[PDB]
Amino acid sequence: KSLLPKKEINVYIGMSEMQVKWYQKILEKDIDAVNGAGGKRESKTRLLNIVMQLRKCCNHPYLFEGAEPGPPYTTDEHLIYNAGKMVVLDKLLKRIQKQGSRVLIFSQMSRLLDILEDYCVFRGYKYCRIDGSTAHEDRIAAIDEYNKPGSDKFIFLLTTRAGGLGINLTTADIVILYDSDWNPQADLQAMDRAHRIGQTKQVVVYRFVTDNAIEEKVLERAAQKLRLDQLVIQQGRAQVAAKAAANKDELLSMIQHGAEKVFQTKGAFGTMAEKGSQLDDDDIDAILQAGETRTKELNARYEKLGIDDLQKF
Amino acid sequence: SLLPKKEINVYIGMSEMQVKWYQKILEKDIDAVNGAGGKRESKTRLLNIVMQLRKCCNHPYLFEGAEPGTTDEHLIYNAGKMVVLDKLLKRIQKQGSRVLIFSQMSRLLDILEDYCVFRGYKYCRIDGSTAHEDRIAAIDEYNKPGSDKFIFLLTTRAGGLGINLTTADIVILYDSDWNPQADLQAMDRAHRIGQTKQVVVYRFVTDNAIEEKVLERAAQKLRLDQLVIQQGRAQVAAKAAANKDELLSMIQHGAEKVFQTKGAFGTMAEKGSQDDDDIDAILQAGETRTKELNARYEKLGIDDLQKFTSESAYEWNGEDF
Amino acid sequence: SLLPKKEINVYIGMSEMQVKWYQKILEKDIDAVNGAGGKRESKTRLLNIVMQLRKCCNHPYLFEGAEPGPPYTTDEHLIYNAGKMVVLDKLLKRIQKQGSRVLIFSQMSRLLDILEDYCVFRGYKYCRIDGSTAHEDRIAAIDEYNKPGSDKFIFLLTTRAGGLGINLTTADIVILYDSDWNPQADLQAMDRAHRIGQTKQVVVYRFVTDNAIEEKVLERAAQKLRLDQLVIQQGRAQVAAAANKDELLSMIQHGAEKVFQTKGAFGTMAEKGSQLDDDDIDAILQAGETRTKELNARYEKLGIDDLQKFTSESAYE
Amino acid sequence: KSLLPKKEINVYIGMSEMQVKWYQKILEKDIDAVNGAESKTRLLNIVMQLRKCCNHPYLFEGAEPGPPYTTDEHLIYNAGKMVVLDKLLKRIQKQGSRVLIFSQMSRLLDILEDYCVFRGYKYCRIDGSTAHEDRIAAIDEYNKPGSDKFIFLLTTRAGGLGINLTTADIVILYDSDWNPQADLQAMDRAHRIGQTKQVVVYRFVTDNAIEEKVLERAAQKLRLDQLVIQQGRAQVAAKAAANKDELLSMIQHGAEKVFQTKGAFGTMAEKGSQLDDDDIDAILQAGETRTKELNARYEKLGIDDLQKFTSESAYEWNGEDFAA
Amino acid sequence: KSLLPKKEINVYIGMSEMQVKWYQKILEKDIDAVNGAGGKRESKTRLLNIVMQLRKCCNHPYLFEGAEPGPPYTTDEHLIYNAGKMVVLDKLLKRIQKQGSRVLIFSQMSRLLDILEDYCVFRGYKYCRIDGSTAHEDRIAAIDEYNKPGSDKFIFLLTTRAGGLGINLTTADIVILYDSDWNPQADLQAMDRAHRIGQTKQVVVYRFVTDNAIEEKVLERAAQKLRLDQLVIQQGRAQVAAKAAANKDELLSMIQHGAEKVFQTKGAFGTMAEKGSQLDDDDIDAILQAGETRTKELNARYEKLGIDDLQ
Amino acid sequence: SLLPKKEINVYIGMSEMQVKWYQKILEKDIDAVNGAGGKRESKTRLLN
Amino acid sequence: KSLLPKKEINVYIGMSEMQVKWYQKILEKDIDAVNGAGGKRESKTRLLNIVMQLRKCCNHPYLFEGAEPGPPYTTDEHLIYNAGKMVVLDKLLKRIQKQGSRVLIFSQMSRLLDILEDYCVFRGYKYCRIDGSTAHEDRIAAIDEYNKPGSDKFIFLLTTRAGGLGINLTTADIVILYDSDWNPQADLQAMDRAHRIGQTKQVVVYRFVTDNAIEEKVLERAAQKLRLDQLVIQQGRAQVAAKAAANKDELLSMIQHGAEKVFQTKGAFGTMAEKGSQLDDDDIDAILQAGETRTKELNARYEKLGIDDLQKFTSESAYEWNGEDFAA
Secondary structure, eight states: OOOOOOEEEEEEEOOOHHHHHHHHHHHHHHHHHHHOOOHHHHHHHHHHHHHHHHHHHHGGGGSTTTTTSSSSSSSTHHHHSSSSSHHHHHHHHHHHHHOOOOOEEEEEOOEEEEEEEEHHHHHTOOOEEEEESSSHHHHHHHHHHHHTTTTOOOOOEEHHHHSSSSSTTTTOEEEEEEEEOSHHHHHHHHHHHTBBTTTSSSSSSEEEETTHHHHHHHHHHHHHHHHHHHHHHHHHHHHHHHHHHOOHHHHHHHHTTTTTHHHHOOOTTTHHHHHHHOOHHHEEEEEEHHHHHHHHHHHHHHHHOOOOGGGGO | OOOOOOEEEEOOOOOOHHHHHHHHHHHHHHHHHHHHHHEEEEEOHHHHHHHHHHHHHHOOGSSTTTSSOSSTHHHHHHHHHHHHHHHHHHHHHTTTEEEEESOHHHHHHHHHHHHHTTTTEEEEEEEESOOHHHHHHHHHHHHHHOOOOEEEEEETSSSSOOOOOOTEEEESSSSOOSSSSHHHHHHHHSSSOOSOOOOEEEEEETTHHHHHHHHHHHHHHHHHHHHHHHHHHHHHHHHHOHHHHHHHHHSSEEEEHHHHSSSSSSHHHHHOOOOOOHHHHHHHHHHHHHHHHHHHHHOOOOOHHHOTTTTOOOOOSSSSO | OOOOOEEEEOOOOOHHHHHHHHHHHHTTTHHHTTTTTOOTTHHHHHHHHHHHHHHHHOOOOGGGGOSSSOOOOOOOOOTSSSSHHHHHHHHHHHHHHHTTEEEEEOOOHHHHHHHHHOOOOOOOOOEOOOSSSHHHHHHHHHHHHHTOOOOOOOOEETTSOTTTTTOOOOOOOEEEEOOOOOOOHHHHTTTSSSTOOOOOOOOEEEEETTTSSSHHHHHHHHHHHHHHHHHHHHHHHHHOOOHHHHHHHHHHHHHHHHHHHHHOHHHHHHHSSOOOOHHHHHHHHHHHHHHHHHHHHHHOOOOHHHHOOOOGGHHHO | OOOOOOEEEEEEEEEOHHHHHHHHHHHHTHHHHHTTTTOHHHHHHHHHHHHHHHOOOGGGGTOOOHHHHHTTTTHHSSSSSHHHHHHHHHHHHHTTTTTTEEEEEHHHHHHHHHHHHTTTOEEEEEEESSHHHHHHHHHHHSSSSSOOOOOEEEETTOOOOOOOOOOEEEEESSSSOOHHHHHHHHHHSSTTTOSSOOOOEEEEEEETTHHHHOOOOHHHHHHHHHHHHHHHHHHHHHOOOOOOHHHHHHEEEEEEEEOOOOOOOOOOHHHHOOOOOOHHHHHHHHHHHHHHHHHHHHHHHOOTTTTOSSOOOOTTTOSSSOBB | OOOOOEEEEEEEEEEEEEEHHHHHHHHHTHHHHHHOOOHHEEEEHHHHHHHHHHHHHHGGGGTTTTTTSSSSOOSHHHHHHHHHHHHHHHHHHHHHHHHOOEEEEEESSSHHHHHHHHHHHHHOOOEEOSSSSOOOHHHHHHHHHHHSSTTTOOOEEEEEETTTOOOOOOOOOEESSSSSSSSSHHHHHHHHTTTTTBBBOOOOEEEEHHHHSSHHHHHHHHHHHHHHHHHHHHHHHHHHHHHOOOOOOOOOOOHHHHHHHHHHOOSOOOOHHHHOOOOHHHHHHHHHHHHHHHHHHHHHHHHHHOOOOOO | OOOOOOOOOOOOOOHHHHHHHHHHHHHHHHHHHHHOTEEEEEEEEHHO | OOOOOEEEEEEEEEEOOOHHHHHHHHHHHHHHHOOOOSOOOOHHHHHHHHHHHHHHHHHGGSSSSOOOSSSOOOTTTTHHTSSSHHHHHHHHHHHHHHOOOEEEEEEEEEEHHHHHHHHHHHHHHOOOEESSSSHHHHHHHHHHHHHHHTTOOOEEEEEETOOOOTTTOTTTOOEEESOOOOOOOOHHHHTTTTTTTOSSOOEEEEEEETTSSHHHHHHHHHHHHHHEEEEEHHHHHHHHHHHOOOHHHHHHHHHHHHHHHHHOOSOOTTHHHOOHHHHHHHHHHHHHHHHHHHHHHHHHHTTTTTSSSSSSSSSSOTSSSOOOOOBB
């Protein structure tokens, strides 16, 4: 049956004033690692921590303790306009529901799904959730709850880790990757819960990217890793074909090649029929001339082929 | 500087004698040739037809009873390659060049031995089923400064790895191997370190017969090998972890603007957190940047994606952040 | 057919003003220059000297209070106060005269700012990608310079700015004002114009301050570039260090015909017959050591291109 | 102290009439796989049987003349390597040299044990089934000054780490290991720190048989291991950052000439501030010249000539303990 | 949606006279390794050869050279009655087609699929084939052809290798494993080409097993590994729960436990309410006896559970 | 021979003073005891 | 020959007033990860940074930038009395030199050897050094020199992971592990530069451990992994013996067991000699009684051997050199 190609769209998002303060605070508390480096041994683990904190800031400031206005922590509109992605999500979901579409929202951080839960109740969105701490049959209980015909649920909150487990959620048609995994295949594996055989509608995948921040630069490395993985796949294909011996069909096409021309020939075959004896200096000069031309012709056909054009030969 | 090697295919016809044997081979198993065999069959009978046809393209005397019931001119003129070789060798000797000749079949080198005696050529020989000490002597005698020999008879996979015959400057592949590397390593006996002259390789290929089709399958296999070698860095770089240089560029990406900003960032600051039209402008501009990102990267080869070992050698900042 | 690019090091001196600043930088911390102090000192002190000498080899106006006193004008002193600017001025002039366009790369954005004032001073139409430049901006900057019949002439970039795979084949000359510490960075900047779609011969000019710090910087990068090539060229070695079918088949078939031929004993045994006087042993050891030398001297001299087994060798037929 | 380099000599050996019969029988009993037709498991069996035949026919059951099995000269003249070994050992003893004999197969050392008893050769043995206290009893009994022992039989993968038998100067590899690094450990039981005499290593190779082909494939992997070593050194140096001394040499370069300079420096001094086309042609001409000369100096540095810091080589012991 | 569970049935099959001759010949051509032993270094590699040949004999005698009646070859009923599995396959397919069912046929050996191709043509069965190492675009072309509405095909020949590629073949309802993979998950990966989301009918899987031969013994060893995979899966789940920290919901149950009874109490709590002072050692014996009683009871609740529960 | 160990849970009550403080703790944070915060609130409040 | 066993002695050291300030500064600048009294979700990557900084603090504060006194910067006595290990080392070396002993000093950090270099020159201590950035040409010019008779040298500074396999410095008798590796076998190699074949004197190894700090706890965690490696080694011994088939020596004792007693017997054997005919169940009660007695006795013999008593064929300890060479 017809499976429409998935529309994968990056939506670039800014940061709230609160996010800017925290993003600045994160960079400040390790400016020496940012400004220069330490011993190469030290810098890597020290920079890797900055990455996660900036990753958290791009997701939501409330992931940091004491950020949300002090106790009591009430769920109001502040939960949305204090995070850049929430503002985009709030209006994106409002349009998604009106067009009769159901949405899966994946995330790297379970504490962010916790934030999304308080938002869903604040807006009245019926939802399901698989964290990864979820047990085996509580997974299946949530899948069935969402896929049942005439379901009341609308959003399915998942961690990207628990997305690629062989679960099928074709009853949703829109995928929102709130943040991206470092392995592009893991994000690609999460998309294939809605865009797989069984889907009837157009799958649209929204990849939230905090523009002009660390998430925009990460997008370029994920773009590399997705391409290098594509090349390894191609090298395996060319390697299988290169290690492959001739088939029964391959041997036959070689034998029959020109066999008809031989059966017709009565006297002499080919270059011997032209001359056939006592090669003259000009006679060999013509063969070597025509041979070198045909030699260039053979090399030209295969030198222009390359990996991405493998399944021609 | 080592001059790149000239590789030239010499497409050659066949004699009247070869026509009869080529037809007899096609006839004694003609039902197999037209595709009659079942799929469960072995490859042996199909390969037997191939081996006999290649023998016919080399020299008809490879078949028992083919040669008339003496070493004379008929030895040269009853094989299309032998006619081409005879004048090609006579012209090679005059210009002072020395030649290596490779073959798949040791019994064809038996024919070339009688040829080199008929024409009075000095030669040595390594069947590859000779002996280590014997082929050491055959090598050194051919490379002896002031060598008497002119031709050197070899089978393609014979000498081993790294023997040196650079005192010869021309290589003739009487017939070709199934694996392109065996012929490629046969050329590299002459085209390797120490060669002072230009190495030229002649590949006898019987035109419009089976050997013309063997050449294209071997030409494919060489190209498939080249892509598997060339994309060898893909397995490495696809699993590599980020350098200090990589992580540093990730954290500093936009750090200048964030410090400069005293309100919010782009989407939120300008708009102020409040339209269908504003969001539809984001999805529009977002999808455009996605296409341009996909097109720019999904065309790339491994020359742009490969990470040199020297990049992790982070030494200083270009702009001291 | 894509022509191999021409890479040329252009060795440049320093103006009288640079020598003054170059001396001051060396003087203000002459202890570290002469290698004084403890060996426990962190790398920060020397690296700061490297930065200042690198800026000084680029342009003295990168130091505050260098440009002639207030008020500040943009004139010919912007050219003749830096040796690289003097060579670049006639080089750019000759580039436009021959109908060529040029990409100019740099490590420092504050230098591209200086080059901006130069391009406006000489009336050059130009584009700029900074690395501090938004995505949609540099897309338009790429397209502007790549438009057919483009007004622009010079493209100012930082060696890292654009990212992978951007195309600037509408230029055929590349000028590296200053070099990068890792050679792949500069090599990627040349391949902005030296890639598929480039019709004309790509020429790359690399400005190098002769007899100063940048000449010594360059040798190190050239070394690290040579190291990388040896690694990459030898990347096939570990996967080669199992056994093919043919490799196992050749081990069994080796000499098997001669075995079937033999009815009595094999070589050493047939000729001498399980009894060996001193002379026969002496030949065995002399023949072996001779074969041992020729075997070792043949393989210990080889390279990866001879040991590497093609994947098509597994296609046994 | 001065440690004389080891002399490694391949001793190419033929096969007795009995070996030829079995070698033919092995090839014939599976001539289908020998011909070319897919599982290497069928070939790996043929290889192992041929190695046994190159070593000794009595490793095959029913080969030795039927019961009773008597130890006589037939234990020697029915194996090509035994004939060479018996006269080699005889000369080794006459020149006052003692020999360690290694083998891949413990059942072959069993054959050598019966040989040593038949010839009156005092011996010791470490089989990798030998207790520590029994190993140390054999080591000392062989090394004690004025020792009576002459031959020491060991398995190549006995796995003794740091065993010292420097009181012997000759090592005989009856058959060869598939990993050349394992044999190099067996050599470095006599050729190690403590050795005073010239170490000579004899590697028995059955000429014109499977053992000769194995010998060539071992040299290929032996060279490939060297190439990996060199790629590793070139890799470490390529990722290495500059030292305080390396940064210092960069800073100090030309610093004296700058302090020496009163006016302008170099190009700006040679023709100041205004350059005609003749000036640019001279800079570009010398610049392209110095670029070619600079590249030529670095284009000549291959993997085989790299600055070694640690001095490992594929042709010396890994320090790796090969207990299989 | 409703996905009916798959019927997995082992079809135990005998051997033809020709198979017995070769099965004897294989066992005889190396009987000393079979009945006894060689060296532990020799025997294991030597036995692995015997296993591979015995499975070829259980599959089809024509896989051996010179076995098929003297060439020239022909496709007759001899191609069928000379292999036990083919005879059973011949009558099963005759019933399979009449009940309006289509079958995927897996095998470890492509040279056996080569035999099945000649069989399918000999009976007039429309088929497709995906061979281990078939080009990707050609590999896609058969999936689409077999699944297209109103398809002409009836049999789909596959290698167990080319099964687990993420291909979907739900338009068939019968799967025949001509022979079994040593890795039980590989055969289980082959069944899910038809028994997956999209299937509407009852999936039946026939696993051909040569009874009283090596293939029957493999069946026992393969079932053991199938259970060991379940045990590792269960150990992983039990490991995660042991590594898991308490929920906010778990902590809430800990705080609330007995909180209402504490608010209810006006004086002191259970043991201190019953007595409260330093009273008799009869009181301590009453607590310790009930304490040892509740401990035996408490341990009993959790010593009941097992790796198969986790609930 | 090592004798297996007798493991006994000995179940105990609280004094009148403890009941007071056990109530005072549950009272001074009665909202969290009833479960008031959203899923985003950290465990710190309940853990205390 | 007799190779005297190594004396491995942990010498516990305190911290200077300056070290305490930095140790406090390290803990305070990331106290939320240290406390674990709230969320306890904080990542390990944040702790690995705290661990690495506290290890530098235990070595020397001058590894932190801005610690050492501002201009004028001078190498004086403050290089010693600001680090607890330097104070102990300074007096340790003073006693070591007078008794005619030479010392190898190892370290995990090459930048610490830099501090030791300034220290060695400040006191007039002749030294050599191997970093792994010092070439083989320079290696043999110093190690093979250091051993030469009448050497002027007294101290040899090396990094624990210099990599030198088979480098032997038996002309030194004292090994100082200024700081410890997290793989004990890496420290074992550093010891086995002096405590190996060729040594004539008693090798003493001093392992500096900052008491009541992170270095004391690491030492206790190092003993666990060091102990667990012995168990892995011992389990391997039991595995090989369990997988071992019987040799002809094992088979011969089985055939010979009681064969003489059988050759001597001319009537019935054992139990059949007692009765032979099927007699009282008192006889079966006596056999089952005697059989159950011998069964418990057999179980007791093998239930009392257990691991750590497994027979030694190869002399590998977790407490001796791996044989592997370590490079950082």
